[PDB]
Amino acid sequence: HDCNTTCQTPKGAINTSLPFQNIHPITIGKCPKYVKSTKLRLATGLRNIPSI
Amino acid sequence: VQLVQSGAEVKKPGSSVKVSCEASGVTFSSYAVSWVRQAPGQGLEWMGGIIPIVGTANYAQKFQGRVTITADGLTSTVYMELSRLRSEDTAVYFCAREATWKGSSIGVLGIWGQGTMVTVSASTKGPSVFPLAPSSKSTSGGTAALGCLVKDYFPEPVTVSWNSGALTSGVHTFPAVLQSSGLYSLSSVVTVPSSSLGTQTYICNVNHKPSNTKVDKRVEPKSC
Amino acid sequence: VQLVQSGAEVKKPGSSVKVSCEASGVTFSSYAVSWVRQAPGQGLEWMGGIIPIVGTANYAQKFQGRVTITADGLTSTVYMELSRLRSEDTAVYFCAREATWKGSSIGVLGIWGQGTMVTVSASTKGPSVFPLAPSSKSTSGGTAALGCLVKDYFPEPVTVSWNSGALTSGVHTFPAVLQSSGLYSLSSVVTVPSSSLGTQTYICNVNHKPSNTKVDKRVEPKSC
Amino acid sequence: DIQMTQSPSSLSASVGDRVTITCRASQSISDYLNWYQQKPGKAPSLLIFSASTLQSGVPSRFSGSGSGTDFTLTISSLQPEDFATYYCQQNYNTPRTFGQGTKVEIKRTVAAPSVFIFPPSDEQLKSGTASVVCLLNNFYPREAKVQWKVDNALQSGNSQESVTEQDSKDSTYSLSSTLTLSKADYEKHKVYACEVTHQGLSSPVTKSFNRGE
Amino acid sequence: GLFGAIAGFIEGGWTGMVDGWYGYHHQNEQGSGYAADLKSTQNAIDGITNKVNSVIEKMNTQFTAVGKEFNHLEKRIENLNKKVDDGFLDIWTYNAELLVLLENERTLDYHDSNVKNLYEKVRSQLKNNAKEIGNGCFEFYHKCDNTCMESVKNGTYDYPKYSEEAKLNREEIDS
Amino acid sequence: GLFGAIAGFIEGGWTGMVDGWYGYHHQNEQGSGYAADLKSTQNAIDGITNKVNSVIEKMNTQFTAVGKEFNHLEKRIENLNKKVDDGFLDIWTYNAELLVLLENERTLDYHDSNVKNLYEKVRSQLKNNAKEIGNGCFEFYHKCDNTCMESVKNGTYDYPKYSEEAKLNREEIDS
Amino acid sequence: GLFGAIAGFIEGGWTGMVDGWYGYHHQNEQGSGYAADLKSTQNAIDGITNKVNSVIEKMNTQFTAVGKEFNHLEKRIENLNKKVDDGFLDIWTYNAELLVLLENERTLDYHDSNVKNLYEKVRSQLKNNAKEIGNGCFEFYHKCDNTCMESVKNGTYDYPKYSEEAKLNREEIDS
Amino acid sequence: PGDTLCIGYHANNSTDTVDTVLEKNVTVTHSVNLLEDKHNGKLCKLRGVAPLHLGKCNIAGWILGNPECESLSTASSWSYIVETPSSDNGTCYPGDFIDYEELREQLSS
Ligand SMILES: *[C@@H]1O[C@H](CO)[C@@H](O[C@@H]2O[C@H](CO)[C@@H](O[C@@H]3O[C@H](CO)[C@@H](O)[C@H](O)[C@@H]3O)[C@H](O)[C@H]2NC(C)=O)[C@H](O)[C@H]1NC(C)=O
Ligand SMILES: *[C@@H]1O[C@H](CO)[C@@H](O[C@@H]2O[C@H](CO)[C@@H](O[C@@H]3O[C@H](CO)[C@@H](O)[C@H](O)[C@@H]3O)[C@H](O)[C@H]2NC(C)=O)[C@H](O)[C@H]1NC(C)=O
Ligand SMILES: *[C@@H]1O[C@H](CO)[C@@H](O[C@@H]2O[C@H](CO)[C@@H](O[C@@H]3O[C@H](CO)[C@@H](O)[C@H](O)[C@@H]3O)[C@H](O)[C@H]2NC(C)=O)[C@H](O)[C@H]1NC(C)=O
Ligand SMILES: *[C@@H]1O[C@H](CO)[C@@H](O[C@@H]2O[C@H](CO)[C@@H](O)[C@H](O)[C@H]2NC(C)=O)[C@H](O)[C@H]1NC(C)=O
Ligand SMILES: *[C@@H]1O[C@H](CO)[C@@H](O[C@@H]2O[C@H](CO)[C@@H](O)[C@H](O)[C@H]2NC(C)=O)[C@H](O)[C@H]1NC(C)=O
Ligand SMILES: *[C@@H]1O[C@H](CO)[C@@H](O[C@@H]2O[C@H](CO)[C@@H](O)[C@H](O)[C@H]2NC(C)=O)[C@H](O)[C@H]1NC(C)=O
């Protein structure tokens, strides 16, 4: 298609806004590390305990 | 680290402007970044800031609902977008990473960008340059003063040079004023020796890019 | 995750039986796993559980010294072994991982296996299928009821079908009973229209695998 | 909201003397205060944070002090590089607020202003307006009073002023006052005078011209 | 958790406290309301930003190497290439998952510690002049106006100033 | 250790307490004995199982690649293969040893925290009605029957109910 | 920090205390001075040595493999070699930096815990016989000579021995 | 009763969940994702320059000039080479391409 991006993969094009990606091991360009994980979320706040 | 901002921009009132601010050799960062504007001749004014670890952006009340400070995921680039510009929005806009040698420092702007000049204007009026003749009344102490008067121009800036840049000693370019009519006017004056009114001719090279007006006015020593 | 248990087994009294329970796509896990049996028609009964991080197994008192719940190292497969079986041990046995969406949850069985039927028997007595003739006294509202009587069989199950599976509407297979003599007996009855006693012949296909007794008894409308 | 008020708004000092700039907040802000320096045309740079801690890369002569409401940026010895407006900012709450700014300037000997008056140009009188320029050139200190007198009558609400920054070598100011009126009102009066009062002047010095000359 | 305050002796959070991570709720004659503690919140925001930076700043984007192609007589080096690709992937996948899990546990404990430290600072100040009523709340034996409340939230609270008052009310219910 | 309770102000363990990790020993007119604290023990067992799971669940068994064979003219790729095998082995060997050491330290601290938090819950309840006699033990100033003991092990203990009693015995030895 | 003592309720360090990491400063009729606490300092030195050992002992020096050379028809295996070298370097560089950062945070918290545990041991002993005056300092309600001071630094301090004295002085200012 | 001062912490409408080592699916007030899992499903042009799509040809057919690769003659610049899995044209005349794989790696740069 007529789209730009900075990281290309065989199955599409992905954004490089995050340090990890799980879409495809094969990439060309400045790309994040490929991992097999389905979730990588760093906590920054507290445990959320609203009115109980 | 070095913050690099987008270039200067010109926008008409009522539009929207977006400014970028990128860091060097970082790719991914979570430092909070603040934006500060500076109107010509005034002090600093805090517009807002973004704290990536909490995913929110705080803004000054006078800009709330009109400015958005965004960042692309965890990338170091931070964007400031201002909507519905006016003439009072013409200023230099700075981005600043809120870090020190101690690490992230949420309230202090350790490293600043180069600034981004944004001028809002919907009318380009060309100036009129009028001579200031070095009369004998304008001669004192063996030196005679003379200059040119820049009038009827909007917007800034206008650059005045003497002898096509040859005369730089004694050249005094007074800062522009805002008259009641809503335009700008400044006077550029130089001091020259009295025994040069006949030999050396003096001109003032005045430029006004927005109106595309280039004028060169000669001073008239001659007589009365 | 899915817990998959070993197949159904038949054992004679006084022997020992071992049941496996494996998880999917895990290889190594430390989740505690409990085993729960269910006698036919009764409620759930907790037998025991193993807590790999402490390397011990807790058991209900009624099974202590007779059941061992083991796991091979840190593998997800958990084995339950019961010794000295009796007829009262005939039940469906379930394994359950003690985990929820919150992680390991030591006391609640979040994910269950498919169950493992274990039948303990040392005698296979063949049933006798006796007709239930649709008399006029068994005719009411334009429909006549008729069936067959399964008698003298041990152990379960016996499957009764009508018209070699053709007749399924109105077929009522009553659950087996335990008589004072120690055997089982059930009655399978169907309701048929009154204007079919002469045209359509009705049979009951009764199966008893343990004794290898297959019998087909015809009902006799005829007369008195 | 917290308001920060610097004082003085501008000061003059020599090279090597101690410089003392103050900064006051509306409410107590503990030591959550920072200091900045901004050279002309250049982005501001951080000097002090936490009201005492010194940012890496700026010299030891800059020092911070104060806790509570009043704060002090102390320059033990003044050097030519340290010539820029200095701002104080609080980071105690949001929105963050700066001070109005304090400019630091080279101190020099008193200089009398050279007063030059300029009649409006002939090309100007063909348009319908009238501008008369009074030049105050190479004077110190900055404080000056310019009064426009037409036919020996004081003029009010018809003039504006423009001051030039302290020149790098002579360290003097330059002021230009422009008296703007219409051509119709220009031809009803004859005497046009500009009165200049300064420290170096024992008496106000007036330069005057007539309409025909 | 590890410090017993969050989801511990302070059972739940304050949805009505929107301007900070930790802080106080007050109630006196002048008024009531939630107020964020600036010092603890400000420092914690710096710490978490440093923690996130220390994980992602060194994870700079790189140029992925070319996917190699091998012929039928190159199976050994093809398998070696496959071993190399699989070896790196397993290490990064396992480490990144494990590191985030360990970091997240410390982040929650870090918030727990800051609440507990904040509670101790108030408790260390008030001493006999207030009664510990559980759930992280203090009931004063004396009247504490708005000015008095900020002194507790400052490390300045004057125990002798209210001691004579608080002593009488304390022994009144004590008798 | 990191929280000062285990091998700290509670010097040793209870061999006679076989049904739990943490808990209490009581003594009154009705009787005595050790009793496990269910809530702390139950949660801790879940946590350690999660901790062990988070280390081993992603360590799935894999098929080891074929040991390559090289000829006399293939020393460079033979050494590259050796470099690859040695490189992976060093990383896994070093990381696994280091990770277990770090995890084990946190496991002991986790148990230490849970004991300290359990001790604080009891101390926060009893207040003046009991005397802290060290080694994690409380001596009541009032009679505490079996019913009273469970209230302390529940978070329900009624301070005013025994306050009038305990106050008199406290001031009796205080005078 | 994580335990609130160092740079917390004990604001600063003691430059004049040169013979240990943690300890006490005393002042009485006999004299004054700083004295190191042997038990806490001795154990902490062992722990940090173990911590440094557990990081570096397994980092034995090794023989670096030969830098390979490839011709113009060997770009694929040249790139594979480059991928192998870059892959190992990134992992060790990222892990070593991250590990030191995480370890350093625990080292500071470890020192913080030891100070807090040391402070609690003294506080648990003195009880009503001394007044907590902040900054980790205790003011006695009785005279505590040099012999008495070491008993506090030992876990032996006899509360009843000075109780009758300290009780009178306490209630004297209390009245 | 008396005036009260409490100590507490923040809560919000966040359904964000993170996993820890001792607990799973913990709801937190704030979090940052690190994993990208979305693609546009299209082959785009990296850094402005469009890719070189070989059509029904493999690299051999393109570099040799197979008549089915006719449109591939204005090749001047590309970010990367796209080959389809079903590309079967290549060397129409039967034979062996010598060092074909090293040529492909050579052309990757
Ligand atoms: C993908 O990004 C490229 C690169 O920016 C886009 O090409 C650019 O498109 C813009 C708008 O159509 C144009 O930019 C102009 O470039 C000339 C010099 O090339 C410059 O003198 C102008 O001032 C202006 O910047 C131009 O077509 C082209 N520019 C460049 C430098 O490549 C392309 O359009 C993007 N495609 C998509 C689908 O977003
Ligand atoms: C969950 O809570 C968040 C807050 O953290 C909600 O986002 C908030 O949405 C409200 C409107 O729904 C925003 O209020 C607006 O505030 C501005 C000034 O800030 C004011 O000018 C507007 O008139 C309006 O009152 C609020 O700013 C915004 N806050 C943030 C941090 O985004 C969100 O809507 C909630 N989600 C739900 C209820 O599903
Ligand atoms: C470019 O590629 C196309 C396919 O994408 C080629 O078409 C294929 O051409 C061959 C040569 O004739 C066909 O092989 C023959 O097929 C017939 C019928 O199946 C069979 O009887 C013969 O024994 C022989 O196998 C093939 O079927 C045909 N289609 C395909 C493969 O789908 C085309 O020739 C190529 N052009 C070149 C290389 O210049
Ligand atoms: C830790 O401190 C060092 C030294 O003060 C910082 O490194 C300096 O960084 C500044 C720019 O930020 C340079 O001008 C200096 O030349 C650097 N000095 C040295 C010795 O490297 C370092 O940036 C600080 N760390 C952080 C995370 O800010
Ligand atoms: C954390 O919660 C998620 C979502 O509730 C769990 O993922 C679900 O798992 C169940 C089966 O256990 C599936 O039926 C759902 O479709 C899943 N949903 C999603 C969004 O993935 C996850 O299993 C929980 N984590 C743990 C460790 O139990
Ligand atoms: C890459 O990022 C862009 C934005 O930087 C994504 O496009 C946005 O996606 C949002 C999703 O909420 C939509 O509203 C719009 O389609 C886009 N908005 C804006 C402002 O750009 C794009 O989907 C991302 N591509 C990925 C992840 O593959």
Give Dmax (Cα) for chain C: 74
Nearest by CB to F87, which of G59, G88, G116?
Answer: G88
CA G87 to chain centre: 37
Report the alpha-carbon distance of residue A23 to residue A25 in Å, rounded: 7
Instruction: Provide the chain F residues 10-39 that lie in CB contact (below 8 A) with chain G.
Output: none
Q: Cβ-count burial of A8 within 10 angstroms (0-12 exposed, 13-18 middle, 19+ buried)?
A: buried
Strands D4-7, D97-98: pairing kind: unpaired
Query: CA-nearest residue of chain B to E46?
Result: B104
Given a contact cutoff of 8 angstroms between Cβ atoms, the answer to whether G148 and G162 are in contact is yes
E neighbour chains, 3+ CB pairs within 8 Å = A, B, D, F, G, H
G113–F3 CB contact, under 8 Å: yes
Contact B105, E46 (CB under 8 A): yes
Assess H23–F contact: CB distance below 8 Å, yes or no.
yes
Domains and their CATH numbers in chain G:
1-171 (3.90.20.10)
- Before C134, cis peptide (omega within 30)? no
Q: Out of D49, D54, D56, D60, give the residue to mutate to test ligand 4, the one with the largest number of ligand atoms within 8 Å of its CB.
A: D56
D10: which strand partners? D103
The verdict on a CB contact (< 8 Å) between E91 and G91 is yes
Of C140, C211, C205, give the one whose Cα is nearest residue C173: C205
CA distance E94 to A40: 11
- Best to test chain A binding among H17, H44, H45 (most A CBs inside 10 Å): H44
Report d(CA B208, CA E75) in Å as an integer.
72
Chains contacting G (3+ CB pairs below 8 angstroms): E, F, H
Q: How many residues does chain H have?
A: 109
| Phi, psi torsion values for D87, nearest 5 degrees | -120, 150
C-F contacts (CB, under 8 Å): 47
Question: Rounded to the nearest whole angstrom, what is the distance from the C-alpha of residue F50 to the centroid of ligand 5?
Answer: 15
CA distance E31 to chain F (A): 29
Ligand nearest to the CA of A15: 6
Terminal-to-terminal C-alpha distance of chain C: 63
The structure was resolved experimentally with X-ray
For residue H89, which phi and psi values (nearest 5 degrees)?
Answer: -80, -65
Cβ pair H102:G79 closer than 8 A: no
Test E103 with A20 for CB contact under 8 angstroms.
Answer: no
CA of D36 to the centre of ligand 4 (A): 19
Cα–Cα distance between F50 and C105 in angstroms, integer? 9
| Preceding peptide of D8 cis, ω within 30° | yes
Cα F78 to ligand 5 centre (Å): 46
Nearest to G54 among F4, F79, F98 (CB): F98
Ligand 6 atom nearest H40 alpha carbon:
28
Q: Which residue has the tokens 């790139």?
A: G79
Cα separation of E69 and E81, whole Å? 10
Name B40's Cβ contacts closer than 8 Å, sequence gap at least 6.
B90, B91, B92, B156
Q: What residue of E is the nearest CA neighbor of F65?
A: E83
CA distance D141 to B179: 26
- Tell me whether B106 touches chain A (CB under 8 Å): no
C-alpha to C-alpha distance for C160 and C150, rounded to whole angstroms: 9
Instruction: Identify whether the C-beta of residue F138 lies closer than 8 Å to the C-beta of residue F132.
Output: yes
* E170–G contact, CB cutoff 8 A: no
CB–CB of C221/C133 below 8 Å? yes
Cα F140 from Cα F129, distance rounded (Å): 6
Q: Which two tokens stand for residue D191?
A: 């005497």
* Cis peptide bond prior to C210, omega within 30° of 0: no
Output the CA B38–ligand 2 centroid distance in Å: 29
Contact yes or no for E77 and G82 at CB 8 A: no
Q: Exposed e or buried b for every residue in F123-142, given b needs 16+ CB within 10 A?
A: eebbeebbbbeeebebebbb
Per-residue exposure over B46-80, b if at least 16 CB sit within 10 Å of its own CB, e if not? bbbbbbbbbbebbbbeebeeebbbebebbbbbbbb
> CB count, 10 Å around CB of D119?
23
Report the nearest atom of ligand 4 relative to the CA of B100. 28
CA distance to partner chain G, nearest, from residue F11 (Å):
13
Which residue out of G83, G103, G113, G131 would a mutagenesis test of the E interface target, given it has the greatest number of E Cβ atoms within 10 Å?
G83
Ligand nearest to the CA of H68: 3
Q: Which residue of E has its CA nearest to H99?
A: E71
In chain B, the residue whose alpha carbon lies closest to the alpha carbon of D170 is B170
Identify which of F154, F153, F155, F158 has the alpha carbon closest to the alpha carbon of residue F142: F158
Compute the distance between CA of residue H21 and CA of residue A43 in angstroms, rounded to an integer.
13
3-state secondary structure of G128: helix
Is H53 flagged in the annotation as binding? no
CA B132 to chain centre: 27
Going from the Cα of B5 to the center of ligand 1, the distance in angstroms, rounded, reads 20
With beta carbons less than 8 A apart as the criterion, state whether F115 and F6 touch: yes
What residues pair up with F26 in beta bridges, in sequence order? Answer: F33
Asked whether B24 lines ligand 4 (CB < 6 A), one says no
User: Cβ separation of B187 and D178 shorter than 8 Å?
Assistant: yes
Q: Hey, which residues 9-28 in chain E have their CB within 8 Å of chain H?
A: 10, 12-15, 17-18, 20-28
Q: Rounded distance, CA D15 to CA D34, Å?
A: 24
F11 CB contacts (<8 Å, ≥6 apart)?
F135
Residues B61, B66, B67: CA angle, nearest 5 degrees: 85
Kindly list the residues from chain C whose CB atom is less than 8 angstroms away from the CB atom of residue F100.
none
- Of the candidates E45, E49, E59, the beta carbon closest to that of B28 is on E59
Which of E97, G92, G57, E98 is closest to F91 using CA atoms? G92
For C108-123, the three-class secondary structure string (H helix, E strand, C coil) is CCCEECCCEEEEECCC
Closest CA relative to residue G132, chosen from G1, G10, G6: G10
Task: Report F:25-64 residues touching H (Cβ under 8 A).
Answer: 46-48, 50-51, 54
G76 interface with H at CB cutoff 8 Å = yes
Question: What residues 10-49 of chain H have any CB closer than 8 A to a CB of chain C?
Answer: 23-25
- Nearest chain G CA: its distance from F156 CA (Å): 25
**D210 interfacial to chain B (CB closer than 8 Å):** no
Under a CB-based contact definition with an 8 Å cutoff, are residues G138 and G11 in contact?
A: no
Residues of A in contact with E103 (CB under 8 A): 42-43
Pocket-testing residue among H13, H29, H30, ligand 2, by greatest number of atoms within 8 A of Cβ: H13
Q: Do the chains D and C touch each other, judged by at least 3 C-beta pairs below 8 angstroms?
A: no
Q: Give the separation between CA F37 and CA F150, rounded to whole angstroms.
A: 10
- Which positions ≥6 away from B130 have C-beta within 8 Å? B148, B149, B151, B217, D121, D123, D124, D131
Q: Resolution of this entry in Å?
A: 2.8
- For F:23-82, CB contacts with C below 8 A are 42, 45-46, 48-50, 52-53, 56-57, 59-61
